[PDB]
Amino acid sequence: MAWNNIVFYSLGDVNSYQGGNVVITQRPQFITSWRPGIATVTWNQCNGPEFADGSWAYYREYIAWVVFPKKVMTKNGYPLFIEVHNKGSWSEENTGDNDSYFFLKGYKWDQRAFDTANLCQKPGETTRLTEKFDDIIFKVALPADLPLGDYSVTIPYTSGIQRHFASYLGARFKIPYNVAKTLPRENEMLFLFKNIG
Protein backbone atom coordinates (compact mmCIF):
# COMPACT_ATOMS: atom_id res chain seq x y z
CA MET A 1 0.00 0.00 0.00
CA ALA A 2 1.15 3.62 -0.74
CA TRP A 3 2.13 5.67 2.33
CA ASN A 4 2.60 9.34 3.35
CA ASN A 5 4.22 10.82 6.50
CA ILE A 6 4.01 14.58 7.18
CA VAL A 7 5.83 16.25 10.08
CA PHE A 8 5.89 19.96 11.04
CA TYR A 9 9.18 21.20 12.66
CA SER A 10 8.44 24.43 14.54
CA LEU A 11 11.07 27.13 15.20
CA GLY A 12 10.84 29.10 18.48
CA ASP A 13 12.82 32.33 18.86
CA VAL A 14 12.29 35.58 20.83
CA ASN A 15 13.58 38.79 19.23
CA SER A 16 13.16 42.59 19.45
CA TYR A 17 12.82 45.30 16.82
CA GLN A 18 13.05 49.07 17.28
CA GLY A 19 10.59 51.01 15.08
CA GLY A 20 11.61 54.37 16.63
CA ASN A 21 9.65 57.66 17.07
CA VAL A 22 6.58 57.77 14.83
CA VAL A 23 3.43 59.83 14.27
CA ILE A 24 0.09 57.99 13.58
CA THR A 25 0.30 58.92 9.85
CA GLN A 26 3.52 56.85 9.53
CA ARG A 27 4.06 53.04 9.06
CA PRO A 28 7.04 51.82 11.15
CA GLN A 29 8.58 48.61 9.77
CA PHE A 30 10.01 45.44 11.32
CA ILE A 31 11.96 42.56 9.76
CA THR A 32 11.16 38.92 10.48
CA SER A 33 14.37 36.94 9.87
CA TRP A 34 14.42 33.15 9.35
CA ARG A 35 16.74 32.00 12.13
CA PRO A 36 18.13 28.45 12.03
CA GLY A 37 18.15 26.79 15.46
CA ILE A 38 16.41 24.05 17.48
CA ALA A 39 12.99 23.07 16.02
CA THR A 40 10.24 21.16 17.90
CA VAL A 41 7.66 18.86 16.19
CA THR A 42 4.21 20.42 16.85
CA TRP A 43 2.10 18.38 14.34
CA ASN A 44 2.27 15.17 12.29
CA GLN A 45 0.03 12.91 10.20
CA CYS A 46 1.53 9.50 9.30
CA ASN A 47 0.52 6.06 7.91
CA GLY A 48 4.04 4.81 6.90
CA PRO A 49 7.26 3.52 8.52
CA GLU A 50 8.59 5.73 11.35
CA PHE A 51 12.21 4.83 10.38
CA ALA A 52 14.12 4.35 7.07
CA ASP A 53 17.03 1.95 7.81
CA GLY A 54 18.84 2.80 4.55
CA SER A 55 17.89 -0.36 2.60
CA TRP A 56 14.74 1.02 0.81
CA ALA A 57 13.68 4.18 -1.10
CA TYR A 58 11.31 6.99 -0.10
CA TYR A 59 10.48 10.40 -1.71
CA ARG A 60 10.96 13.85 -0.09
CA GLU A 61 8.76 17.00 -0.35
CA TYR A 62 9.80 19.96 1.90
CA ILE A 63 7.81 23.21 2.38
CA ALA A 64 8.84 26.10 4.65
CA TRP A 65 5.96 27.99 6.34
CA VAL A 66 5.49 31.41 8.05
CA VAL A 67 1.98 32.02 9.58
CA PHE A 68 1.77 35.67 10.70
CA PRO A 69 -1.08 37.66 12.40
CA LYS A 70 -2.77 40.44 10.31
CA LYS A 71 -3.72 42.30 13.52
CA VAL A 72 -2.47 42.49 17.15
CA MET A 73 -3.82 44.18 20.30
CA THR A 74 -1.71 46.48 22.50
CA LYS A 75 -1.76 46.02 26.34
CA ASN A 76 -3.81 49.30 26.60
CA GLY A 77 -6.47 47.83 24.19
CA TYR A 78 -5.79 49.22 20.67
CA PRO A 79 -5.41 47.38 17.29
CA LEU A 80 -2.18 47.46 15.25
CA PHE A 81 -2.54 46.45 11.57
CA ILE A 82 0.25 44.24 10.14
CA GLU A 83 0.85 44.73 6.39
CA VAL A 84 3.35 43.17 3.94
CA HIS A 85 6.13 45.53 2.81
CA ASN A 86 8.59 43.01 1.24
CA LYS A 87 7.97 39.24 1.13
CA GLY A 88 10.93 38.40 -1.17
CA SER A 89 10.31 35.12 -3.05
CA TRP A 90 7.81 33.69 -0.46
CA SER A 91 4.44 32.48 -1.85
CA GLU A 92 1.70 34.51 -0.15
CA GLU A 93 -1.36 32.22 -0.12
CA ASN A 94 -4.98 31.95 1.17
CA THR A 95 -5.10 35.78 0.96
CA GLY A 96 -8.83 35.94 1.76
CA ASP A 97 -8.19 34.80 5.39
CA ASN A 98 -9.28 37.57 7.84
CA ASP A 99 -6.81 36.85 10.64
CA SER A 100 -3.49 35.48 9.34
CA TYR A 101 -0.97 35.65 6.46
CA PHE A 102 0.32 32.31 5.02
CA PHE A 103 3.79 32.43 3.44
CA LEU A 104 5.10 29.22 1.83
CA LYS A 105 8.26 28.12 0.02
CA GLY A 106 8.19 24.68 -1.64
CA TYR A 107 11.89 24.01 -2.28
CA LYS A 108 12.16 20.19 -2.59
CA TRP A 109 9.81 17.65 -4.31
CA ASP A 110 9.91 14.20 -6.05
CA GLN A 111 13.36 13.51 -4.56
CA ARG A 112 14.15 9.76 -4.26
CA ALA A 113 16.40 8.87 -1.30
CA PHE A 114 17.81 5.92 0.71
CA ASP A 115 19.42 7.94 3.57
CA THR A 116 18.67 6.48 7.04
CA ALA A 117 16.12 8.92 8.56
CA ASN A 118 13.40 9.44 11.21
CA LEU A 119 10.33 9.60 8.90
CA CYS A 120 7.65 10.37 11.52
CA GLN A 121 8.99 12.27 14.57
CA LYS A 122 6.41 12.81 17.33
CA PRO A 123 5.12 16.08 18.91
CA GLY A 124 7.69 17.31 21.44
CA GLU A 125 10.72 15.77 19.66
CA THR A 126 13.51 18.21 18.74
CA THR A 127 16.15 18.62 15.97
CA ARG A 128 18.52 21.38 14.72
CA LEU A 129 17.31 23.14 11.50
CA THR A 130 19.95 25.08 9.49
CA GLU A 131 17.92 25.91 6.36
CA LYS A 132 17.80 29.61 5.37
CA PHE A 133 14.94 31.52 3.68
CA ASP A 134 14.11 35.19 2.77
CA ASP A 135 13.46 37.88 5.35
CA ILE A 136 9.85 39.15 5.46
CA ILE A 137 9.56 42.91 5.96
CA PHE A 138 6.28 44.09 7.48
CA LYS A 139 4.86 47.63 8.03
CA VAL A 140 2.48 48.59 10.91
CA ALA A 141 -0.52 50.95 10.54
CA LEU A 142 -1.26 52.66 13.89
CA PRO A 143 -4.89 53.72 14.60
CA ALA A 144 -5.39 57.54 14.51
CA ASP A 145 -6.63 57.48 18.13
CA LEU A 146 -3.62 55.48 19.50
CA PRO A 147 -2.64 57.19 22.85
CA LEU A 148 0.80 58.94 22.88
CA GLY A 149 3.70 57.17 24.58
CA ASP A 150 6.02 54.16 24.60
CA TYR A 151 4.83 50.81 23.20
CA SER A 152 6.28 47.34 23.68
CA VAL A 153 4.16 44.85 21.69
CA THR A 154 4.61 41.03 21.68
CA ILE A 155 3.78 39.60 18.22
CA PRO A 156 3.61 35.76 18.33
CA TYR A 157 3.93 33.87 15.04
CA THR A 158 4.62 30.43 13.53
CA SER A 159 7.55 29.37 11.34
CA GLY A 160 9.01 26.02 10.39
CA ILE A 161 9.39 23.23 7.87
CA GLN A 162 6.83 20.72 6.73
CA ARG A 163 8.65 17.49 5.67
CA HIS A 164 6.55 15.04 3.59
CA PHE A 165 7.99 11.51 3.09
CA ALA A 166 6.19 9.21 0.63
CA SER A 167 6.57 5.73 -0.94
CA TYR A 168 5.85 6.99 -4.46
CA LEU A 169 6.99 9.47 -7.13
CA GLY A 170 4.71 12.50 -7.69
CA ALA A 171 3.57 12.73 -4.06
CA ARG A 172 2.08 16.10 -3.00
CA PHE A 173 0.77 17.24 0.38
CA LYS A 174 0.24 20.66 1.90
CA ILE A 175 -0.73 21.10 5.56
CA PRO A 176 -4.35 22.44 5.24
CA TYR A 177 -4.56 26.23 5.83
CA ASN A 178 -7.15 25.65 8.68
CA VAL A 179 -4.48 23.48 10.45
CA ALA A 180 -1.53 25.82 9.64
CA LYS A 181 -3.54 28.75 11.18
CA THR A 182 -3.78 26.84 14.51
CA LEU A 183 -0.15 25.52 14.74
CA PRO A 184 1.40 26.86 18.04
CA ARG A 185 2.96 30.33 17.60
CA GLU A 186 6.40 29.61 19.13
CA ASN A 187 8.24 32.68 17.76
CA GLU A 188 7.87 36.16 19.29
CA MET A 189 8.71 39.54 17.79
CA LEU A 190 8.76 42.24 20.50
CA PHE A 191 7.90 45.40 18.49
CA LEU A 192 9.10 48.70 20.10
CA PHE A 193 8.05 52.26 19.10
CA LYS A 194 7.11 55.65 20.58
CA ASN A 195 3.91 57.34 19.45
CA ILE A 196 4.87 61.09 19.30
CA GLY A 197 2.99 64.37 18.57
Ligand X SMILES: CC(=O)N[C@H]1[C@H](O[C@H]2[C@@H](O)[C@@H](CO)O[C@H](O[C@@H]3[C@H](O)[C@@H](O)[C@H](O[C@H]4[C@H](O)[C@@H](O)[C@H](O)O[C@@H]4CO)O[C@@H]3CO)[C@@H]2O)O[C@H](CO)[C@H](O)[C@@H]1O[C@@H]1O[C@H](CO)[C@H](O)[C@H](O[C@]2(C(=O)O)C[C@H](O)[C@@H](NC(C)=O)[C@H]([C@H](O)[C@H](O)CO)O2)[C@H]1O
Residues 166-195 that bind ligand X (CB under 6 A): 172, 174
Closer of 58 and 151 to ligand X (Cβ): 58
From the CA atom positions of the chain, what is the Rg in Å?
19
Which residues form the interface with Zn ion (CB under 5 A)? 143, 145
**Count of other CB atoms within 10 angstroms of residue 36:** 13
Q: Name the DSSP letter for residue 55.
A: S
| Selected binder of ligand X within 106, 123, 143, 176 (CB under 6 A) | 106
Contact between 39 and ligand X (CB under 6 A)? no
Q: In the chain, count of helices (H) and strands (E)?
A: 1, 15
Instruction: For residue 144, give Cα distances in angstroms to 43, 99, 121, 180.
Output: 40, 21, 48, 32
Smallest distance from Zn ion to CB 140, Å: 14
Could you give the CA distance from residue 68 to residue 32 in angstroms, rounded to a whole number?
10
Smallest distance from ligand X to CB 82, Å: 20
Q: Which does 145 bind (CB under 5 to 8 A by kind): ligand X, Zn ion, none?
A: Zn ion
Residues lying near ligand X in the complex (CB under 6 A): 61, 63, 91, 93, 104-106, 109, 172, 174
